[PDB]
Design a protein around this ligand. Sequence first.
Ligand SMILES: [Ca+2]
Ligand SMILES: [Ca+2]
Ligand SMILES: [Ca+2]
Ligand SMILES: [Ca+2]
Ligand SMILES: [Ca+2]
Ligand SMILES: [Cl-]
Ligand SMILES: [Cl-]
Ligand SMILES: [Cl-]
Ligand SMILES: [Cl-]
Ligand SMILES: [Cl-]
Ligand SMILES: [Cl-]
Ligand SMILES: [Cl-]
Ligand SMILES: [Cl-]
Ligand SMILES: [Cl-]
Ligand SMILES: [Cl-]
Lengths: 377, 377, 377, 377, 377
Amino acid sequence: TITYTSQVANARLGSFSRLLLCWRGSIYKLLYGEFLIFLLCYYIIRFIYRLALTEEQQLMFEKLTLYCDSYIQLIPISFVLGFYVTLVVTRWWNQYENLPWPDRLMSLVSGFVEGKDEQGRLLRRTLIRYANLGNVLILRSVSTAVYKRFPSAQHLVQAGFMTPAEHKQLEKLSLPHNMFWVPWVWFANLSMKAWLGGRIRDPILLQSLLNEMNTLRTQCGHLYAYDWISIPLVYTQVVTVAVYSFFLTCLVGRQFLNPAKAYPGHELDLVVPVFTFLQFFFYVGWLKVAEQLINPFGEDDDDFETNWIVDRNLQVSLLAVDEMHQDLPRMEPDMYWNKPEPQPPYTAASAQFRRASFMGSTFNISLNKEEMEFQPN
Amino acid sequence: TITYTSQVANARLGSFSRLLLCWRGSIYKLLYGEFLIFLLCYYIIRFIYRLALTEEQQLMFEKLTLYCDSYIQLIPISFVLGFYVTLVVTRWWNQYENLPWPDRLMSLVSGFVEGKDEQGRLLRRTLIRYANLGNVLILRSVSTAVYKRFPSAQHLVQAGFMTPAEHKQLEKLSLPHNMFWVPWVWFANLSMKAWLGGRIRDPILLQSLLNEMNTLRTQCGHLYAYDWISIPLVYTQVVTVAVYSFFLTCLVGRQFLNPAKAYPGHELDLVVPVFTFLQFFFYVGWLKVAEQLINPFGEDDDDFETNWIVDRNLQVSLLAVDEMHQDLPRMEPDMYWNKPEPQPPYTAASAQFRRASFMGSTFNISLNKEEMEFQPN
Amino acid sequence: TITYTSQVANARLGSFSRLLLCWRGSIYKLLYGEFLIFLLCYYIIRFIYRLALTEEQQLMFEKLTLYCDSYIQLIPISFVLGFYVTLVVTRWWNQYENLPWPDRLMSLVSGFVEGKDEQGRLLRRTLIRYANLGNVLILRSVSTAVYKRFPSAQHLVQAGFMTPAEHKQLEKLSLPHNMFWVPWVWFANLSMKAWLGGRIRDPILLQSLLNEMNTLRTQCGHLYAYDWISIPLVYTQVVTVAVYSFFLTCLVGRQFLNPAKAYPGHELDLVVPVFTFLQFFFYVGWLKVAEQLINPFGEDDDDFETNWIVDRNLQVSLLAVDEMHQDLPRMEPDMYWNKPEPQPPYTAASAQFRRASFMGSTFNISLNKEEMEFQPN
Amino acid sequence: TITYTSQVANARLGSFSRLLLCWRGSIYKLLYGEFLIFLLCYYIIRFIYRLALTEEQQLMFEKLTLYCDSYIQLIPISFVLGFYVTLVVTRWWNQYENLPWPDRLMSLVSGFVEGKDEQGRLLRRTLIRYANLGNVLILRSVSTAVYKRFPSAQHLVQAGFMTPAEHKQLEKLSLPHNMFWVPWVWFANLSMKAWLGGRIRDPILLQSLLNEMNTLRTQCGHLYAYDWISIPLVYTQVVTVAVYSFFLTCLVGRQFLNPAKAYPGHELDLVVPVFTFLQFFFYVGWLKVAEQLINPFGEDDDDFETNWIVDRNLQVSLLAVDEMHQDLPRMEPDMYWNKPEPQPPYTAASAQFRRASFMGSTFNISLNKEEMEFQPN
Amino acid sequence: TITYTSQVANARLGSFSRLLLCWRGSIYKLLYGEFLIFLLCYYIIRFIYRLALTEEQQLMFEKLTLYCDSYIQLIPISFVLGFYVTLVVTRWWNQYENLPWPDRLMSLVSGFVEGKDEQGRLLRRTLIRYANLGNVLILRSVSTAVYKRFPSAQHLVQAGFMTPAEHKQLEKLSLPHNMFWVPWVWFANLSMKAWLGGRIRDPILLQSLLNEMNTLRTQCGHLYAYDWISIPLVYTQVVTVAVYSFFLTCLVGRQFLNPAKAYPGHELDLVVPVFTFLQFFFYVGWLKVAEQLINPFGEDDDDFETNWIVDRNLQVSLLAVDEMHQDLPRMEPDMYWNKPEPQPPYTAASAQFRRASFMGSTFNISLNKEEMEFQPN
Ligand SMILES: [Ca+2]
Ligand SMILES: [Ca+2]
Ligand SMILES: [Ca+2]
Ligand SMILES: [Ca+2]
Ligand SMILES: [Ca+2]
Ligand SMILES: [Cl-]
Ligand SMILES: [Cl-]
Ligand SMILES: [Cl-]
Ligand SMILES: [Cl-]
Ligand SMILES: [Cl-]
Ligand SMILES: [Cl-]
Ligand SMILES: [Cl-]
Ligand SMILES: [Cl-]
Ligand SMILES: [Cl-]
Ligand SMILES: [Cl-]
């Protein structure tokens, strides 16, 4: 994830232009190899046309260039790129929206599951560890960085996400499918055992716990779905064919012809086709947006920081269910205890953001007395 | 389903270009017959123009070609293809989103329904089998592969999805509609009987079970809706007419005219119209995206693997409600038992993904002392 | 509803081309009158230009045709058609998504409301009849076919959807608005009376019943909203003006001028403007998509089969709450009773769809021993 | 709201053409002033060019017209209009979707709150009046018609939406913000008092009541949000600048030049530029779609009928909670009491809509005996 | 936030034209620096071409200008701007939709948590203060104005959002991540303590409270997600490159060439390229829409008024849970006590908005007696 949110907080002078001086997650980093290949091919074709062809062959090449340049069209490539990249970006944000966060569940575990003794603490930690274990089980299946961190389930044992007993239990339950769903059944059965043991006082709290757990299950199932059901290969190949055919025909039709032949539109030899190169940067960077976002769980600069998410979820969940269980700050009267209209102060740097309330768009509508009286019937 | 998610994890050099060397679910596999027909028609017209027409007829054909080539427009076909294919892809992902997964329901069945004896085990298995039976009943109605697997309900009896008693009960309840909804009523009545029999301890657990069951019912009803209410035939015919008229007029207007006549734009005879063929690949592959995704439950390469889904759901549901009922791994203190900030290790292959936390975009905003003081009033 | 889902299960050779040989819900059925009017007007203008004008008048007509043909633009019509038809299709599928289905509610009524005697059976039937009566009350207000079936509420009395007592009660409660909401209040009060009478054992079941009832109420209210708040007339008129002005200027600018005058682009007289006719079919069929889907409750071929939905809902609801109440198939051990990994068989026609499981995209990532070891700290 | 849903029930011959003969909510009603201004400016410029310029000045004007006509582009205006109007229409339908309807809440109030005496009736009426008061408080803030109906809260007192006691209570609770949220807190506290007083028998009914109340609160908050956070002014100004610059350059570049000068494309003087006027109607009507829908709570023809909604909600809510509380029609056996497959009759006008059921798209798949047998293993 | 909703209530004569006379949040305010830079560069290039080049150099510059003007294309920039700005606007409204509002939660806190004594009042205030503290903790992380108001947590202590005890408790729980989630765990544990202490009478009320709290948690987590996961930098750079390359090539190709050379399209020297400047305003304002909305929590004119939201939420929440707890207006019979069809009056200014009810689109369908009779069978 490359974050530049602070750099674009305001629409200042050339705010998006300052983003062009970036390297991580940039157009250049994703495009330099393709651009160098295009450069080499274009200049090889140029040198062949200049110093490697006869006069008749050069005339034939000029006819070919004039024919190719008339078939270079911006409409199909722009249309398919816009629609395909919109689909890719929508799926990318949907994939982020299904990344599981155990915060609601950990709040309910810290609240509902009672007992400051060792058994209740162990129960809360085991429930939240089941949640985190299911999350990491799906993330090591969908994310290459998490898989590199945990190449096997024994790595999850060494990393504290799974106990040897849980590892053996998962080995007993081995079916020829992905077993990320097992910790959810473990969570349901353990919560049932907690409610039957008196640790959960009411079954409505059990229902809330299992509702949050099932929401996490749905998110992980959607992550598995996005990992499994790719965007159809035919669509990706259509977009790739469009872009690459466009620039293959630019590899010939955008060649600068001999200015001594007085060709229409080729009277000037600039050597470097800067407009073709700008089109290359724009179009192949538009393609690279999809090429980077199509699997947001890889190892690109703009890919999701899934290992950080796993670590943060584990730490925060364990702290919430273990150290923060019934550990409250002292409940004391606040600053606005007997002040019916609290007015928190503003700093000197924020005094300009003190704004009057918007009372609705109809507040300033002016009406005279005659038209404000209620008409009978 | 053709999965290439691992191949596009990173935006590497020509990552989408390596996808062009695929055959299953590719442009070529979906396009070779149409392209061969187009090739044959184009070259037959070419040979008729060359060696089967008089001089006046050839001049008339040249006039016709010049007239047809001026009416070849990229705007309508690209517009209608973009919007129609966007609709098709949206409906395709919606159809996947309504494929039923019994994991939440099977967790609730494994937890709520009590009893390690034969009767409670039979009750849990029968409930989860009702869920899977309803799912397979709608899937054999919407999917051609599932229907080929189960041409009749007696095949479902031989496959263990339905007992002979359930088959006879469904035969008694025969109405002149699709009877996929029956197992949901069976599930509701059986869960009510379980709650009245003491197997379900509280009616809130019954409510949760029936909520998950009704969610599965809504998903199956949406699958039936997508199978019944197709995209309107007029829209599909509009897109088909656009594409096929475009290439019917390319069948004549893209013919290479006689270079001895010195026609503008036809001074070169390349024999093979590679740009027309690239346009054909692009546009008819864009059409084939819709032609493949319009019914994602058929037997295409990119169609859903519904038989695998049915088998996996049956196996996982039966294992969850039967073998995993109150079968928990030993609850033991974890690795981070008394470690308030757990730090799971990273492998050498994943040490570069250890990242500092993003504390918000306002964290690096610099303010001096004077503008940080709270102003009075 | 015209269903061709089985015909487009696979992306076969010309699968969308075979849909062009259809008549119901086709382009031709929705377009033949407009196309005949366009044909007659075009050929009348042609005959006026040929055999009804002087030489100077013919020259003036040729100038007018050359001026009109330069203002025939594809961009505005395609843009507005794409966006407007996308809006129409989205609203059409939203209107289908709000068609009420009582299956969840009927499952909850069959389960929760107890009593195999006459009173409990009457109670269940009356509740589900209130649901179906509200559905049919909104559908006879939004659908022309349902209104033709039930022109008055007395027709609903003769059709069994309403009793004479309910008809008199609705006549007492007559307000100058649509009274489709009344059966929902009836359902709520009857369910409260059932819970107070002991027929509903717990108020949580009452809450579930009323939640499903309120979901049906929201769907019917959305149907009323879509019937009331049309797409704004200005937008529809904008699209209509665009299309009809395009073809009014094609009625003159696409006329074949005299070939003896040697006009650029008019050197050939084809008599029949096949490309203008293909554009007419495409564009006015794109318009007809919106013209058919804008009110999906009318009597078009692709309009919703609302009368069938009403009949199916009534039959299925009455069967579910009356005959299927606590009427369960015998609960017996299944085929996979002691088989921990069930494997249902495949037919010879479906053996090719037996697929291995997708274990995640990271499953085939290769790592050596050195980079798989956990690094310290 | 202009409703033409009945006029577009079928895709008949020129169904959208018959909508062009409308005046309320039409293109002409929203466009006549702008079109007359454009007409006057165009003909003033025409008369200046004809009878108010010297020969050299006329030649300079002709050069200016030829220069302006080459910069008249349809692409930017169509793109920005399509995207902006799509945003406006989406926000308009979202604003309708957040218009509060108290029907679910009034059903729950009529059911849950018990007592046919004066106190329970007063309690139900006060709860539903709190709901309607909150709705009208937000609607008089977002809608100009509702504000004209109730310029002050004392008008709400005279209109029965608020009692003098509630008006005084709201005056006591005066904060410098919009106080539409107060009746929701009133509803919550009154429902709590009702449950503690025995009028609400179970707290689950209290939860359902407050859930419906909070849904209404969310809808009203979204209405306030749409009233407050407008579409950004820069986007609206971009679209306005595009359209108005397009027609300002059409005001000169679309002038008919002198035909005696033999200008290319200006050899004919039609006086009235009908194609420029059609473009004006189309584009400025596309703009007027956004200009009318951007605030759907104003006083346009297609704006929401908010006063009718308020009146209908008040009447229906009071009738539902007061007269329909435990007032049920007599529960009697229906027409299909012992008829397991009910078949309601069809009228002669609706007999053609009797359709066979769609049993799924796989129902007609033909398989022979050999390929239907289950293969072993 | 710049609100002009009242100015666009009606589609009046030039309603969007009157918005062009605005300065705050306008095109000019966001564009004047870029436009002045473009103006200076264009006129510097103009003066170099006029008074700083030789005749051969001027001819070369004319060739360069003719070459650059043929590569100025509107299609890619318009496509990428439309799609990118649509994405930005969608994300901007999603970010507003996840701004937390404690109104539902404060209603439930005012209702459920009992006790008019000091302890219950302190409990309600502490719960609602936990909600507001979590909201302000995420808003000071995502919003620059809120961070300027509260540069540190000690500023939150001085502003009454946090007590010194809560500040010390948060300092004890310090993990190397953002600690905005802590008040949600505090809320859950405090609500559990309230229910165990008898302040919350039933656990269903506890479930409702924690459901509203978890909804607020999800909204704040989505705000954190939008702050962290920016739109990918490659897409922003693609759009920026497109726009800036378009206007860099307009900086040369739109120069007015020497009219004495008689160049096609350059026969007139207008000095000021008003059409290029209109294109600049339109396109760079379209870009500025995204440049302003990409981070809606900055300090732009159209950015969200987050400090006002924080203050309003604090005041309204404290008033609702403290002063409005069981403080109800006197429950008295209303104006329509025994009036079954209430008719609130209309003012003279609103009498035209009194409209008859829409009874459905099928209400005016005419049928004769013969076709209204039910057909047998
Ligand atoms: Ca990636
Ligand atoms: Ca298919
Ligand atoms: Ca219709
Ligand atoms: Ca309006
Ligand atoms: Ca901003
Ligand atoms: Cl799921
Ligand atoms: Cl170039
Ligand atoms: Cl459903
Ligand atoms: Cl070609
Ligand atoms: Cl509703
Ligand atoms: Cl034609
Ligand atoms: Cl809300
Ligand atoms: Cl014109
Ligand atoms: Cl969340
Ligand atoms: Cl210019």
